[PDB]
């Protein structure tokens, strides 16, 4: 049902004394849209290659030459590979493509094995690419792993080897773009966790700050799964909390009021990060949310006490520095480090956005800084899991970008931003940066092989050239907007 299937069939309808039928069929494959799977290509490869090689032998046409010599690349181009199964199935298909019969058939037909989209080339580059893929995924696997070794990795660094220029001819191929999606989905999530761990373990931070960070980690990354080292680290910090930060029992509204306060109070009352509720009759003090609590927090991370930061009638946290650092950020690492370090975790952004926007249009400048940071932050957090150098992130970004106007168009003025101000900040640090110049390089490579076949055939223009150009142009526009 795919491209190769239709081709094998079509070529298996004989008609070789009429080079013109053979050409139409091949030209159709050149422009086909049918996706294929590794097992599918693997089952059809030898027959497909043999039929293409035989097509050139009997018609001597330029289309047949190009097909046979570049079949490996053309077959891989529309490949649908299930990345949950890793590289093995791809390597297994490459083993078939690269087998002795492929060389024997091309040689006997008097054609090359060495085209830029040929079997030798595809075996070498895709093998290398798969090795890079495997290396990219050999980083932290679990939240448990990251907590133990909280390495901070720039999101851009992870898929770096996979989109380097030597792999330019593979870039627009479906399995590559699918693989980029897979790598991003399995690596990016760890950055905010690693960043929060660094704050929890930061000996220059106050005990209360460190305790609250531990709770954000338990809530965002562990839920109900107990990690003993997280457990110990929260307990140590909880035990050292300045008692001045807590509201005295017996004062009005002293009981935890919001879900946040109950969750925090329960963990503090038990010295246990995984306790999130208070059974009735159990006394537990809540953290103060008055302006005086700010002196009990770290100046750069007050928002980590999100209940205080959200209590806008009583307390104004200082978000000017974090908002400044967020604005100045020109990469995912920079902006996410600015957010998380200041206590603007995913959940806190969600809460502070709600709290500030519920007061619009009449916001103070200090409230604007909190709201701006929380609005941009929520958008950054949403995009981060998808972040990468390929088509999937372009699509994920566009989806997010389309929601900004209906969400924020009416509060941007109140937030003190110009028209499109949210998108203008988000684009500065999170805009997709795919190396789409690879698409052009890939086309250049294919046309060099077309031009080689044109010369062997003794022409200066071929239908092959026009079909392939039409195909590549459709892909370039329809996928990348080029
Ligand atoms: Ca699967
Ligand atoms: Ca997302
Ligand atoms: Cl919290
Ligand atoms: Cl998407
Ligand atoms: Cl603009
Ligand atoms: Na998959
Ligand atoms: Na498979
Ligand atoms: Na197998
Ligand atoms: Na080969
Ligand atoms: Na022979
Ligand atoms: Na690091
Ligand atoms: Na300390
Ligand atoms: Na009291
Ligand atoms: Na901090
Ligand atoms: Na105040
Ligand atoms: Na995310
Ligand atoms: Na997605
Ligand atoms: Ni997964």
Q: Do 373 and 461 share a domain, yes or no?
A: no
Which ligand has its closest atom nearest to the C-alpha of 215? 3
Q: Do 221 and 122 share a domain, yes or no?
A: no
- How far is ligand 15, taken at its centre, from the CA of residue 291, in Å? 5
What spatial distance separates the first Cα and last Cα of the chain, rounded to whole Å?
A: 29
What value does the CA radius of gyration of the chain take, rounded to a whole number of Å?
29
Q: Do 182 and 222 share a domain, yes or no?
A: no
Q: Do 178 and 285 share a domain, yes or no?
A: no
**Residue pair 335/326 in contact by the 8 Å Cβ criterion:** yes
Which ligand has its closest atom nearest to the C-alpha of 42? 8
Alpha-carbon gap, residue 195 to 304, rounded angstroms: 13
Q: Do 397 and 324 share a domain, yes or no?
A: yes
Q: Does 134 belong to an annotated binding site?
A: no
Neighbours of ion ligand 6 (CB under 5 A): 82-83
From the list 94, 85, 83, the residue with the least C-alpha distance to 42 is 94
Q: Do 163 and 295 share a domain, yes or no?
A: no
Q: Does 358 belong to an annotated binding site?
A: yes
**Residue pair 426/379 in contact by the 8 Å Cβ criterion:** yes
Structurally, how many domains does the chain consist of? 2
From the list 446, 451, 475, 449, the residue with the least C-alpha distance to 461 is 451
- How far is ligand 7, taken at its centre, from the CA of residue 364, in Å? 57
- How far is ligand 17, taken at its centre, from the CA of residue 222, in Å? 23
From the list 378, 369, 226, the residue with the least C-alpha distance to 309 is 369
Partner residues linked to 79 by β-bridges:
36
Q: 3-class secondary structure for the chain?
A: CCHHHHHHHHHCCCCCCCHHHHHHHHHHHHHCCCCECHHHHHHHHHHHHHHHHHHHHHHCCHHHHHHHHHHHHHHHHCECCCHHHCCHHHHHHHHHHCCHHHHHHHHHCCCCCCCCCCHHHHHHHHHHHHHHHHHHCCCCCCHHHHHHCCCCCCHHHHCHHHHCHHHHHHCCCHHHHHHHHHHHHCCCCHHHHHHHHHHHCCCCCCHHHHHHHHHHHHHHHHCCCCCHHHHHHHHHHHHCCCHHHECCCCCCCCCCCCHHHHHHHHHHHHCCCCCCCCCCCCCCCCECCCHHHHHHCCCCCHHHCHHHHHCCCCCCCCCHHHHHHHHHCCCHHHHHHHHHHCCCCHHHHHHHHHHHHCCCCCCCHHHHHHHHHHHHHHHHHHHHCCCCCCHHHHHHHHHHHCCHHHHHCCCCCCCCCCCCHHHHHHHHHHCCCCCCHHHHHHHHHHHHHHHHHHHHHCCCCCHHHHHHHHHHHHHHHHHHCC
What the block records as the tokens of 225 is 């799964």
Domain end call among 414, 432, 450 = 432
Alpha-carbon gap, residue 58 to 19, rounded angstroms: 8
- How far is ligand 18, taken at its centre, from the CA of residue 186, in Å? 6
**Residue pair 89/47 in contact by the 8 Å Cβ criterion:** no
**Residue pair 374/352 in contact by the 8 Å Cβ criterion:** yes
User: Could you tell me how far CA 311 lies from the centroid of its own chain?
Assistant: 35
Alpha-carbon gap, residue 343 to 211, rounded angstroms: 12
Q: Do 241 and 316 share a domain, yes or no?
A: yes
- How far is ligand 7, taken at its centre, from the CA of residue 92, in Å? 10
Neighbours of ion ligand 10 (CB under 5 A): 108
Entry resolution in angstroms? Answer: 2.0
Q: Do 276 and 383 share a domain, yes or no?
A: yes
Q: Do 247 and 376 share a domain, yes or no?
A: yes
Q: Do 27 and 173 share a domain, yes or no?
A: yes
What are phi and psi for residue 185, nearest 5 degrees? -60, -25
- How far is ligand 11, taken at its centre, from the CA of residue 137, in Å? 17
Q: Does 84 belong to an annotated binding site?
A: yes
Alpha-carbon gap, residue 293 to 130, rounded angstroms: 53
Domain end call among 392, 408, 432 = 432
Q: Do 263 and 326 share a domain, yes or no?
A: yes
**Residue pair 448/69 in contact by the 8 Å Cβ criterion:** no
- How far is ligand 16, taken at its centre, from the CA of residue 378, in Å? 9
Structure-solving method? X-ray
Which ligand has its closest atom nearest to the C-alpha of 396? 4
Q: Do 68 and 14 share a domain, yes or no?
A: yes
Domain end call among 397, 417, 432 = 432
Range of the domain at 43: 1-137+158-187+436-481
């Amino acid at each position: 049902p795919g491209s190769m299937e239709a081709l094998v069939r079509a070529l298996e309808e004989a008609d070789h004394a009429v080079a013109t039928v053979v050409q139409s069929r091949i030209l159709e494959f050149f422009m086909a849209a049918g996706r294929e799977t590794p097992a599918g290509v693997r089952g059809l490869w030898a027959r497909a290659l043999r039929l293409a090689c035989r097509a050139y032998v009997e018609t001597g046409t330029c289309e047949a030459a190009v097909l046979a010599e570049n079949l490996a690349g053309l077959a891989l181009w529309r490949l649908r590979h299930d990345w949950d199964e890793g590289t093995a199935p791809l390597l297994e298909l490459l083993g078939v493509v690269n087998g002795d019969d492929t060389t024997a058939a091309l040689t006997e037909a008097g054609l090359r094995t060495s085209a830029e989209f040929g079997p030798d080339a595809m075996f070498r580059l895709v093998s290398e690419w798969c090795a890079a893929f495997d290396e990219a995924l050999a980083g932290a696997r679990s939240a448990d792993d990251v907590l133990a070794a909280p390495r901070v990795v720039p999101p851009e660094q992870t898929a770096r080897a996979l989109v380097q220029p030597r792999f330019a001819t593979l870039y627009d191929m479906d399995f590559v773009q699918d693989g980029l999606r897979y790598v991003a989905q399995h690596t990016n999530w760890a950055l905010p966790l690693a960043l929060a761990v660094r704050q929890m373990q930061n000996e220059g931070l106050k005990p209360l700050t460190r305790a609250l960070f531990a709770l954000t980690i338990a809530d965002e990354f562990f839920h109900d799964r107990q990690n003993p080292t997280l457990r110990e680290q929260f307990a140590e910090a909880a035990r050292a909390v300045d008692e001045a930060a807590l509201v005295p029992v017996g004062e009005v509204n002293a009981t935890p009021r919001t879900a946040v306060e109950v969750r925090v109070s329960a963990a503090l009352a038990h010295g246990d990060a995984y306790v999130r509720e208070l059974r009735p009759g159990t006394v537990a003090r809540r953290l103060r949310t008055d302006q005086g609590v700010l002196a009990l927090l770290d100046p750069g991370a007050q928002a980590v006490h999100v209940a205080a930061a959200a209590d806008l009638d009583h307390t104004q946290v200082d978000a000017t520095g974090v908002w400044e650092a967020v604005q100045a950020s020109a990469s995912p690492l920079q902006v996410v480090e600015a957010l998380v370090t200041a206590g603007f975790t995913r959940r806190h952004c969600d809460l502070l956005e709600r709290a500030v926007l519920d007061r619009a249009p009449r916001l103070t400048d200090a409230q604007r800084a909190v709201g701006c940071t929380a609005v941009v932050g929520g958008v950054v957090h949403r995009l981060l899991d998808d972040y990468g150098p390929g088509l999937d992130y372009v699509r994920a970004y566009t989806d997010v970008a389309d929601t900004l106007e209906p969400l924020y168009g009416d509060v941007t003025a109140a937030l003190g931003l110009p028209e499109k101000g949210v998108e203008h900040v988000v684009r500065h640090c999170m805009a997709p940066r795919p190396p789409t110049e690879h698409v052009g390089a890939a086309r250049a490579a294919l046309l060099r092989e077309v031009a080689a076949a044109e010369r062997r055939a003794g022409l200066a223009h071929s239908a092959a050239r026009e079909a392939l150009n039409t195909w590549l142009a459709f892909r370039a526009q329809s996928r990348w907007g080029l």
